[PDB]
Amino acid sequence: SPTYHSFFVYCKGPCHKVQPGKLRVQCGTCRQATLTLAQGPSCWDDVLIPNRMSGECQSPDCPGTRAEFFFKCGAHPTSDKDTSVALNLITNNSRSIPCIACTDVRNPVLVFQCNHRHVICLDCFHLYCVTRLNDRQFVHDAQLGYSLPCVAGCPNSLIKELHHFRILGEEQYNRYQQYGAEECVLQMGGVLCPRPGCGAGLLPEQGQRKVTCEGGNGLGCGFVFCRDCKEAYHEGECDRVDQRAAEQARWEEKTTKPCPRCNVPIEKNGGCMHMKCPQPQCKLEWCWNCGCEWNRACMGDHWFDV
Binding residues, as ranges, are 99, 102, 114, 118, 121, 124, 150, 154, 193, 198, 213, 221, 226, 229, 234, 238, 259, 262, 277, 282, 287, 290, 298, 302
How far apart, in Å, are the Cα atoms of 164 and each of 1, 99, 154, 196, 303?
29, 18, 18, 26, 22
Window 242-301: residues binding Zn ion (CB under 5 A): 259, 261-262, 277, 279, 282, 284, 287, 289-290, 298
Choosing from 27, 57, 73, 272, the catalytic residue is: 272
Closest CA to 269 of 256, 259, 280: 256
Nearest 5°: the CA angle 72, 113, 135 is 90
Q: Which of 114, 191, 275, 299 binds Zn ion (CB under 5 A)?
A: 114
| Contact by Cβ (8 Å): 11, 19 | yes
CA dihedral 18, 19, 25, 31 (to 10 degrees): -70
Given candidates 27, 119, 122, 167, which one binds Zn ion under the rule CB under 5 A?
27
CA distance 247 to 151: 13
Applying CB under 5 A, does 188 fall inside the site for Zn ion?
no
Among 73, 148, 167, 272, binds Zn ion (CB under 5 A): 73
Closest separation in Å from C-beta 285 to Zn ion: 9
Catalytic (active site) residue 272? yes
Contact region for Zn ion (CB under 5 A) — 44-52, 58-66, 136-144, 175-183? 58-66
Using the rule CB under 5 A, is 193 a contact of Zn ion? yes
How far apart are the C-alpha atoms of 246 and 218, rounded to whole Å?
Answer: 48
Query: At its nearest, how many Å lie between Zn ion and the CB of residue 32?
Result: 5
Contact mark string toward Zn ion, 121..160, x via CB under 5 A: x--x-------------------------x-x-x------
Q: What CA–CA distance (Å, rounded) separates 37 from 305?
A: 17
Stretch that binds Zn ion, among 37-45, 86-94, 227-235, 247-255 (CB under 5 A): 227-235
Q: CB nearer to Zn ion: give 143 or 281.
A: 281
Beta carbons of 231 and 225 less than 8 angstroms apart? yes
- Preceding peptide of 20 cis, ω within 30°: no
**CB of residue 172 vs Zn ion: minimum separation in angstroms?**
17
Torsion sign (Cα): 157, 158, 160, 161: positive
Which residues carry out catalysis? Answer: 272
